[PDB]
Design an enzyme around this catalytic site. Structure first.
Site, mmCIF file in Angstrom:
data_model
loop_
_atom_site.group_PDB
_atom_site.id
_atom_site.type_symbol
_atom_site.label_atom_id
_atom_site.label_comp_id
_atom_site.label_asym_id
_atom_site.label_seq_id
_atom_site.Cartn_x
_atom_site.Cartn_y
_atom_site.Cartn_z
ATOM 1 N N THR E 1 63.473 36.877 49.646
ATOM 2 C CA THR E 1 64.738 36.174 49.484
ATOM 3 C C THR E 1 64.525 34.670 49.317
ATOM 4 O O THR E 1 63.787 34.048 50.076
ATOM 5 C CB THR E 1 65.690 36.444 50.677
ATOM 6 O OG1 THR E 1 66.262 37.750 50.552
ATOM 7 C CG2 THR E 1 66.817 35.422 50.742
ATOM 8 N N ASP E 17 68.646 34.351 45.006
ATOM 9 C CA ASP E 17 68.150 35.443 44.181
ATOM 10 C C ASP E 17 68.949 36.705 44.525
ATOM 11 O O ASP E 17 69.749 36.703 45.457
ATOM 12 C CB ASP E 17 66.646 35.651 44.387
ATOM 13 C CG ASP E 17 66.325 36.438 45.645
ATOM 14 O OD1 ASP E 17 66.783 36.042 46.737
ATOM 15 O OD2 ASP E 17 65.611 37.454 45.543
ATOM 16 N N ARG E 19 67.472 40.008 44.940
ATOM 17 C CA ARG E 19 66.616 41.129 45.311
ATOM 18 C C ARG E 19 66.583 41.429 46.808
ATOM 19 O O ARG E 19 66.353 40.543 47.627
ATOM 20 C CB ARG E 19 65.187 40.911 44.808
ATOM 21 C CG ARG E 19 64.142 41.681 45.604
ATOM 22 C CD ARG E 19 62.724 41.318 45.196
ATOM 23 N NE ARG E 19 62.468 41.592 43.788
ATOM 24 C CZ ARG E 19 61.260 41.615 43.238
ATOM 25 N NH1 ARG E 19 60.186 41.383 43.978
ATOM 26 N NH2 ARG E 19 61.125 41.874 41.947
ATOM 27 N N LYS E 33 73.909 37.437 47.789
ATOM 28 C CA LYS E 33 73.484 36.730 48.995
ATOM 29 C C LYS E 33 74.302 35.475 49.296
ATOM 30 O O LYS E 33 74.051 34.786 50.282
ATOM 31 C CB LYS E 33 71.992 36.401 48.920
ATOM 32 C CG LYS E 33 71.107 37.635 48.848
ATOM 33 C CD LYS E 33 69.631 37.278 48.806
ATOM 34 C CE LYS E 33 68.857 38.283 47.968
ATOM 35 N NZ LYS E 33 67.422 38.341 48.346
ATOM 36 N N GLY E 47 66.874 36.361 55.940
ATOM 37 C CA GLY E 47 66.487 37.042 57.162
ATOM 38 C C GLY E 47 67.083 38.435 57.216
ATOM 39 O O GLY E 47 67.317 39.052 56.182
ATOM 40 N N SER E 129 61.944 33.802 52.154
ATOM 41 C CA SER E 129 60.510 33.942 51.915
ATOM 42 C C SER E 129 60.035 33.096 50.731
ATOM 43 O O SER E 129 58.864 32.760 50.637
ATOM 44 C CB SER E 129 60.133 35.412 51.715
ATOM 45 O OG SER E 129 60.934 36.016 50.718
ATOM 46 N N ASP E 166 57.407 34.114 44.799
ATOM 47 C CA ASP E 166 57.496 34.917 46.010
ATOM 48 C C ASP E 166 57.746 36.382 45.675
ATOM 49 O O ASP E 166 58.628 36.707 44.888
ATOM 50 C CB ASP E 166 58.601 34.366 46.923
ATOM 51 C CG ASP E 166 58.927 35.289 48.079
ATOM 52 O OD1 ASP E 166 57.994 35.814 48.712
ATOM 53 O OD2 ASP E 166 60.123 35.480 48.367
ATOM 54 N N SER E 169 61.259 37.821 46.547
ATOM 55 C CA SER E 169 62.411 37.462 45.732
ATOM 56 C C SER E 169 62.272 38.000 44.315
ATOM 57 O O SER E 169 61.185 38.378 43.894
ATOM 58 C CB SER E 169 62.599 35.944 45.701
ATOM 59 O OG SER E 169 62.213 35.359 46.926
#
Lengths: 214, 204, 199, 201, 219, 196, 212, 199, 196, 201
Positions: E1, E17, E19, E33, E47, E129, E166, E169
């Site tokens: 994320t 993002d 995902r 999100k 989280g 992340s 990342d 994500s």
């Protein structure tokens, strides 16, 4: 080693048209304490190869001594054969892997830069023996903070010049100093071309603290 | 792991004005099979079904507690619950045990009570909903189900095509999972009918 | 984190760094660690961000009510006692030191250390993870009868020395001078920080 | 894994399933759990696949070497003793191998059970692997020493089939052999699902 | 994320993002999100998905009650205080990493709220992340008082870096622009990734699956 | 380890269990009854942790008997099984969980014979035949091979004997005697104990 | 200190009547980061053998160099190139040699056998191996295998012609399953490298995958 | 334990405290932590007493033989390399830092840090458990071109500041000045130690 | 758990042992022989860890046989017992220790009958009667109550049966058959197996 | 600790040893391991002395209270059930108590075994404590339901004596009771060493 004592942080590596640029700060950290603030973490192997190391400084010094002797030993022969960047990268890979297999690794993450036969070389070698090569590299905290900036620029312009690569490297150093707590604002920039290996420094990045008033 | 203690796989698939829900029929403790017709998919309306995979005991408890709440909800308000509302009800129910959760990952498949619009979703053990427009999987062989669904699923499939897609997905997915199998039950939810089929599957 | 407070005839000088860290990553490089509990009373937060912020807010609320009830500016000692009580009561749960510095009309400018529930008044106090590296420096540089200007210099120097050595400290230096007249803030940016042997 | 072996009047029956797994994932439905050491010597495998395959192949090597040197085929008991001693040198190092050594030497048919702990037993019938308990039930309830060849094949087929039905780590195909005086013969390779459906009919 | 926010000349811009993953498997390729807190206040969540979802819904619900009783626009400071006081109560057990951004009577505000209850008021932040990649972009190109379009571009690039750098994500990039006037929830501002166009093909007929039993119930 | 076994027929349910009460390495009792009569046509076989078994079983028994006293009619096997599961499930996450494994056998006038399987985590499952303990591992496959849905009660007793004989020669535990009971429309009937 | 690292990656082999395909993605990962997007997992052993290796990249590098050295040693002492089957059997023993400090590699050999037919050998980390018709290994192996079972092995399908798998159809299947694995597995992505082994030699192909 | 060595035009100044501790008990309050490896080469021991003494003795022996073989006073770098090798080779077994300071006819007065096998030359070096408290002080007080007298003062002050703050340091201050002329010892007793803010 | 038992009489030593070879919960063999003939008048009963038992026993057996081949005469029971203890003791602190429990029975022309007890730590003890395993706990007291030094061999067999019968009804393990042997001046004699 | 109890034709025999220990140290050779709840009710103790003494005295209190309230003496089964339920409330808290409840109510003689786990069993004979296995051997080999009173006393005396001889944590004196229809009677208090020497003579 089992428990790294004094360690160095991120190491950057960018390939450019006719050479490779590598940067690293001059700090030897002891935990969270900036103990040795004037140590070089970049070593010139030979005329076409340079090496930057992150992690345990004592292990880096040991490798430097072993690599330095190898380059000297081969130079004594004077038979027209000299270790290339790829050959150094391969040797390092084997050395780290052997140590890792004996459960007594050399706690370092290294970046190899070089230029031979009109071809730039940029290799990564970690303590576990994991080795590979790419257009740009960044160890430790640089992988999450500097690598993304490097890849963004390489995605739009695969081949950049020495100046562009130098400016990009300095931009990453500034960001690393801002976000990395184990970093120091005193770095070295090593460049390898056809002329040889040149190590400049100590350099500093112009920082902006305008957000404090915000 | 507690989730693989009894095994089981559940998957829901969206089609053109129709939904499909399938599950394995095995009830076993660790490596030993006990029965081959354990109910994992429960009806929550004429065109609304919930599939539950995970700890058998929690599968039964959650199903029963959800029924308790749905029944009361459908007596209070004089109407059939909407698919989305059921998802929230389940999420709320799962989130109540935030630090001592029920070991079950539910998948809901159905059509809106008044508009007959296909709806599928999946929730994690603590109740985090995830509405998709293609498919949702849950169980010990979720990875296998993902592979099958990702390549077999097509948009706007009809009732017959949807049945074949979800059957092939489940069948081949449970054959690579040691704790999932012993038969497969498929429910095809349409505007005017529900078709329940038991597939010819491996009993090993 | 490095925090410092010095007493001077007529008030106090409170200062700190602005680095908030999460392991090796800097999550906030321009954080203000100086929080006002009252009009003339400040506190320097150190330790756990969540705990320090939770306690400071709690104390500010309690002191605010106290101030209104008594219809008089609260004493610096009262503020320190309010912090000490909270810090002592939840000593096994909280992990943060709220340094107390301010000025009142009864005992002038006072600096209190309330780490772990223990309360002590000092001429100057240093806390946080970077304070260990400047213990020797403050002991050899501090002189009684320092003026406000000299206190700010002393504070600035000490914090700058700690920031350069401590990995958990860094960024800019937040400075606050409290006196009868009022509170006057000051921020020393990276380029205007005192320079010492960094070799 | 389910493997069985029993001696009856017309030789020795050897049967195994063909499932291999990794956690709950079925890695293979067609693994071979019988090594053919020689024309009248067989070895079953259960436990750790790498351990079984490696040590049973090493026994085969020694059996072949034994033949060349002494100019005769090694006996069943001596072959099982070889394996027994081989794995006893690594006792405690977490080897996982439960095997049966079946053959026919000068002392008639022979069946030995050997495991990684160093256990070595001669017997009339044995079953190893995670589905062994289930196989024992079926086998013991239908075993008679005067069983005919066709009857012996059925019992073996039934024992394994039922073990695959109840044991999650067993399944695939049943591979069966028949050890005779003139050597072993491969009986069949029937898919356990085909069998199970016909048994439920 | 990867979630990020930045304060520009006339307001704030949120980005994230789409995902959602289970350990190392993509569960949702398009999860939202950026949650609604109030008409001029939004929040990005990182989280524990269940925690972030339940926490923002709760905060939005409580802010609505407050707004209804006071009869005024909710302040961003009220939201961050409500969030941190709740999060601190659970001592970090409620894994919710939030990026609250909104525009109230006092202007544009941006806050970063952590699981333990700590908060940070900043001109630009990033969580999740892929937070380091996004921060890298911000540090390198952020300027104070940027134009609305210049801020969007920067935020999009910041989120983009996390999406490509990342592993946690991916998917599309959602954005949310908030100013004194209105709010622009740009679900799917950019779709930098997509699957293949399918080289081969495989299909089943109306009887490829052997059926044991059937039961049809007309409604 | 304790052994339980159930076989449901067309109009009857046959159940059996070992009669051994053990304390570490010694058999303190050899005529222990692991069956609890819940009603006129319902039996509850329970094995597991010492104390818990009798405490849970008697607790259930008391409530089933109370139900009959409060309403006049008895609880059906299905209702009793679900009541048991609910109670066992409720204590699962509580401070005092019952570590018991159960088999609920019963006969209903309209629903017919029924056999329920319940593990310690309160997972309820209806089945034609079932077993509990280490003995189930060696007997379940025998049931699989010989059990037919129309099996007569005389043939069921023969099937049960096969399972018991398998334990005698294959099982490492000494279980020389088993309690045998049958439930049909005429109630619960005690059968001759099967001993070796 | 841990001597292993999970570097992701998926490998697939498919055997045909007169061909063998070995394919893999090119992502090299560590933790939640990408080392590089251009690290293929298939190596050429001989003119008719390819090996796919996934797992810990440190061991993947070392194991491939050990196998390359053993091929030359075998050729020097036997005056012939190792056959695909001999390579499979030798790999088994190499992997079992480290049985108490094992290579964390999932190997899949693809090539042609002595009769010129496609051959595929699958391996577990400690050496257990067998010949298969098609096998998927590595990070997204549980997503790919079931699809291969249904599309290549025709499992769970009734009244379906079991036509022999052509090279053309095999190539389309490989590209399809890797595209689907790039959507679900976070470790699979960047690009797909496909090696086709026939009697004419080995030809490579590269297909782009999702970069996110 | 607090140790320090400073370079100056013409030689070096090495100093340390004299406290040997065993938990909270002082087992030796007048211990000399300065050991001579050669005529003009000294080392400051820190960490484990047994290890430091074992290594120092080992190095002295090796350097002694080396010196006689080459028939010339050993280089300071050679001594540091001899210590570095031992410290690096047995890094997992030993737990002591042997600071190296001395003077030779080639590179004058040099100070080397050999902690953990890593070797670095510095203008001044501080080690031991009490060195953490004087990092800020030495960074703000050190100035290039310091004379021998100024180096001894600098050293004395720094060690005194550390001794007062660190529980593992204390007692007297052992001082050694090395130059071409020779080695001159000096001991600063408790009553003659520099006084600072001890309140 | 495995069961061993020895009873020494005026001029004979009677020994017995269970014949069960078990693997977890199943009895893989029911005719397993735990006795190893070391010589014409010496028996070695060994129980314990799988592998170790047979490895140690055969190792001892080979050396005892070698001794007889090298010198002409056989080793006496006492010498053999001490040889065994020494070997077991030597491996105790070594990397590969044998976890076995032994009973050494034998007959000597001049020394008479003898029965030795040896635990896994190589403590050697001579005794009139002894037992090994969990069964010893329930049988040692029976031996204590009925054993007399002049017990005849016919009466000893009766005493052994009492112990075996006690295990049958009190022991939780299923040990239905025991190997029974006797050693006198005429050598080792196999007696009828005692089964239940 | 060794305690036993068996029902024969002439009532119930109860016998115990009198050793208490702390590690390897013998704290007492004269401890009383039988509580007299009432004239026809007895309780033996083994395990943790503080647990046994406390809970058996608490049962005695409840028995006395039961009598006052219902105007009759509590049955053996109900008394054992009381104790069973009492210690089941502290299950898992490391109580240590293994006792036998012996008496004679309206259903003839009664013997129950109750332990800290919640086990409660009715039986013909029982033995508890660390020397229980040894007592079982002797008791079972000499038990007959038609034993005479003198013969029953001997068996009890023998069982305990032999248990003290083999079990290190048992010894001292054997205390024996005889439960009869009109109540229990204390038979003897013989020192186990005196007995053992005469048995070896």
């Amino acid at each position: 080693t089992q428990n790294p004592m004094v360690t160095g942080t991120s190491v950057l590596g960018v390939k450019f048209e006719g050479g490779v640029v590598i940067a690293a700060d001059m700090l030897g950290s002891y935990g969270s304490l900036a103990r040795f603030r004037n140590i070089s973490r970049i070593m010139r192997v030979n005329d076409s190869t340079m090496l930057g190391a992150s992690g345990d400084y004592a292990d880096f010094q040991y490798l430097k001594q072993v690599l330095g002797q190898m380059v000297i030993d081969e130079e004594l022969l004077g038979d027209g054969h000299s270790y290339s960047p790829r050959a150094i990268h391969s040797w390092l890979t084997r050395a780290m892997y052997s140590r890792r297999s004996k459960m007594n690794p050399l706690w370092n993450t290294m970046v190899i830069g070089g230029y031979a036969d009109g071809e730039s070389f940029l290799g990564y070698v970690d303590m576990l023996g994991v080795a590979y090569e790419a257009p740009s590299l960044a160890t430790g905290y640089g992988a999450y903070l500097a690598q993304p900036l490097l890849r963004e620029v390489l995605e739009k312009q695969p081949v950049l010049s020495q100046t562009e690569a130098r400016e990009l490297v300095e931009r990453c150093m500034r960001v690393l100093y801002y976000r990395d707590a184990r970093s120091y604002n005193r770095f070295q920039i090593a460049t390898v071309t056809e002329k040889g290996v040149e190590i400049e420094g100590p350099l500093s990045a112009e920082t902006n603290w305008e957000i404090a008033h915000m | 792991s507690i989730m693989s203690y009894n095994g089981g796989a559940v998957m829901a698939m969206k089609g053109k004005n129709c939904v499909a829900i399938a599950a394995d029929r095995r009830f076993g403790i660790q490596a030993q099979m006990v029965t081959t017709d354990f109910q994992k998919i429960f009806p929550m309306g004429d065109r609304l079904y919930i599939g539950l995979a995970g700890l058998a005991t929690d599968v039964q408890t959650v199903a029963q507690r959800l029924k308790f709440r749905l029944n009361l909800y459908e007596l209070k308000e004089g109407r059939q619950i909407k698919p989305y509302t059921l998802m929230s009800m389940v999420a709320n129910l799962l989130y109540e045990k935030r630090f001592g959760p029920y070991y079950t990952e539910p998948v809901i498949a159905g059509l809106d009570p008044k508009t007959f619009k296909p709806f599928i979703c999946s929730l994690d053990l603590i109740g985090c909903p995830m509405v998709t427009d293609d498919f949702v999987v849950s169980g010990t062989c979720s990875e296998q189900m993902y592979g099958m669904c990702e390549s077999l699923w097509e948009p706007n499939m009809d009732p017959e095509h949807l049945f074949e897609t979800i059957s092939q997905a489940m069948l081949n997915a449970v054959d690579r999972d040691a704790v999932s199998g012993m038969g497969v039950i498929v429910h095809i939810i349409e505007k005017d009918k529900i078709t329940t089929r038991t597939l010819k599957a491996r009993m090993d | 984190t490095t925090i410092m407070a010095v007493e001077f005839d007529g008030g106090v000088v409170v200062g700190s760094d602005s680095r908030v860290s999460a392991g090796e990553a800097v999550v906030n490089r321009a954080f203000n660690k100086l929080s006002p509990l009252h009009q003339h009373i400040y506190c320097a937060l150190s330790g756990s961000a969540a705990d320090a912020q939770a306690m400071a807010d709690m104390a500010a609320y309690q002191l605010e009510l106290h101030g209104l009830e008594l219809e008089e500016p609260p004493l610096v000692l009262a503020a320190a006692n309010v912090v000490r009580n909270i810090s002592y009561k939840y000593r096994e749960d909280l992990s943060a030191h709220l340094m107390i510095a301010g000025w009142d009309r009864r005992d002038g400018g006072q600096v209190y250390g309330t780490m772990g529930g223990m309360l002590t008044r000092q001429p100057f106090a240093i806390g946080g993870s970077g304070s260990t590296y400047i213990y020797g420096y403050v002991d050899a540089a501090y002189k009684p009868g320092m003026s406000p200007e000299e206190c700010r210099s002393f504070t600035t120097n000490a914090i700058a020395l700690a920031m350069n050595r401590d990995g958990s400290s860094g960024g800019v230096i937040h400075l606050v001078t409290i006196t009868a007249a009022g509170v006057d803030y000051q921020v020393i940016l990276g380029n205007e920080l005192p320079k010492f042997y960094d070799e | 894994t389910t493997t069985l072996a029993f001696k009856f009047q017309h030789g020795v029956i050897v049967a195994v399933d063909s499932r291999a797994t990794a956690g709950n994932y079925i890695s293979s439905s067609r693994v071979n759990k019988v090594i053919e050491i020689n024309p009248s010597l067989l070895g079953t495998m259960s436990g750790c696949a790498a351990d079984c395959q490696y040590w049973e192949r090493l026994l085969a090597k020694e059996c072949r070497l034994y033949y060349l040197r002494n100019g005769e085929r090694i006996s069943v008991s001596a072959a099982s003793k070889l394996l027994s001693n081989m794995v006893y040198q690594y006792r405690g190092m977490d080897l996982s191998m439960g095997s049966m050594i079946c053959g026919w030497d000068k002392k008639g048919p022979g069946l030995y059970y050997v495991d990684q702990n160093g256990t070595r037993l001669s017997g009339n019938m044995f079953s190893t692997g995670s589905g062994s308990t289930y196989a024992y039930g079926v086998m013991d309830s239908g075993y008679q020493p005067s069983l005919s060849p066709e009857e012996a094949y059925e019992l073996g087929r039934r024992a394994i089939t039922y073990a695959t039905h109840r044991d999650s780590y067993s399944g695939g195909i049943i591979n069966m052999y028949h050890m005779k005086e003139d050597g072993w013969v491969k009986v069949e390779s029937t898919d356990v699902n085909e069998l199970l459906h016909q048994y439920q009919e | 994320t990867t979630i990020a926010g930045l304060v520009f000349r006339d307001g704030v811009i949120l980005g994230a993002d789409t995902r959602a993953t289970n350990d190392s498997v993509v569960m949702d390729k398009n999860c939202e999100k950026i949650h609604f807190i109030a008409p001029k206040i939004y929040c990005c969540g990182a989280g524990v998905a269940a925690d972030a979802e339940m926490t923002t819904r709760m905060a939005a619900s409580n802010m609505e009650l407050h707004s209804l009783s006071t009869g005024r626009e909710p302040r961003v400071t009220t939201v961050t205080r409500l969030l941190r006081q709740t999060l601190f109560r659970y001592r970090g057990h409620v894994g919710a990493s939030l990026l609250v951004g909104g525009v109230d009577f006092s202007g544009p505000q941006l806050y970063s709220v952590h699981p333990h209850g700590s908060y940070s008021r900043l001109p630009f932040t990033a969580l999740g992340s892929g937070q380091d990649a996004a921060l890298a972009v911000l540090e390198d190109r952020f300027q104070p008082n940027m134009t609305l379009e210049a801020a969007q571009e920067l935020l999009v690039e910041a989120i983009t870096a996390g999406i490509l750098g990342d592993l946690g994500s991916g998917g599309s990039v959602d954005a949310c622009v908030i100013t004194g006037t209105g709010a622009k929830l740009l679900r799917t501002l950019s779709s930098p990734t997509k699957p293949t166009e399918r080289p081969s093909q495989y299909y089943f007929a109306p009887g490829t699956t052997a059926v044991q039993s059937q039961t049809v119930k007309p409604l | 380890m304790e052994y339980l076994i159930g076989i449901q027929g067309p109009d009857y349910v046959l159940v059996a269990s070992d009669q051994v009460a053990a304390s570490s390495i010694v058999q303190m009792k050899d005529d222990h009854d692991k069956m609890f009569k819940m009603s006129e046509k319902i039996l509850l076989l329970c094995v597991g942790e010492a104390g818990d078994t009798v405490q849970f079983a008697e607790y259930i028994q008391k409530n089933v008997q109370l139900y009959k006293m409060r309403n006049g009619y008895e609880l059906s096997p299905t209702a009793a099984a679900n009541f048991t599961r609910r109670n066992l499930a409720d204590c699962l996450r509580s401070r005092t969980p019952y570590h018991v494994n159960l088999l609920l056998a019963g006969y209903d006038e309209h629903e017919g014979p029924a056999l329920y399987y319940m593990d310690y985590l309160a997972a309820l499952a209806k089945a034609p035949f079932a077993a509990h303990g280490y003995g189930a591992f060696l007997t379940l496959s025998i049931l699989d091979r010989y059990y037919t849905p129309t099996i007569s009660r005389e043939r069921a007793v023969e099937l049960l004997r096969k399972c018991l004989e398998e334990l005698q020669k294959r099982f490492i535990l000494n279980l020389p005697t088993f309690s045998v009971r049958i439930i049909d429309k005429n109630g619960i009937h005690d059968l001759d104990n099967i001993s070796f | 200190f841990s001597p292993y690292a999970f570097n992701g990656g998926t490998v697939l082999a498919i055997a045909g009547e007169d061909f063998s395909i070995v394919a893999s993605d090119t992502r090299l990962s560590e933790g939640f980061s990408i080392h590089t997007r251009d690290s293929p997992k298939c190596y050429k052993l001989t003119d008719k053998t390819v090996i796919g290796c996934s797992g810990f990249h440190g061991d993947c590098l070392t194991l491939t160099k050990i196998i390359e050295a053993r091929l030359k040693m075998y050729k020097h002492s036997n005056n012939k190139t190792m056959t695909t089957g001999a390579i499979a059997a030798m790999l088994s023993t190499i992997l079992y040699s480290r049985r108490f400090f094992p290579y964390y590699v999932y190997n899949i050999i693809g090539g042609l056998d002595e009769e010129g037919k496609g051959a595929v050998y699958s391996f577990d980390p400690v050496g257990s191996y067998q010949r298969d018709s098609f096998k998927a290994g590595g990070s997204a192996s549980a997503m790919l295998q079931p699809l291969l079972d249904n599309q290549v092995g025709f499992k769970n399908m009734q009244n379906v012609e079991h036509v022999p798998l052509s090279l053309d159809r095999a190539m389309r299947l490989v590209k399809d399953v890797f595209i689907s694995a790039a959507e679900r597995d976070v470790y699979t992505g960047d690009a797909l490298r496909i090696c086709i082994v026939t009697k004419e030699g080995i030809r490579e192909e590269t297909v782009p995958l999702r970069k996110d």
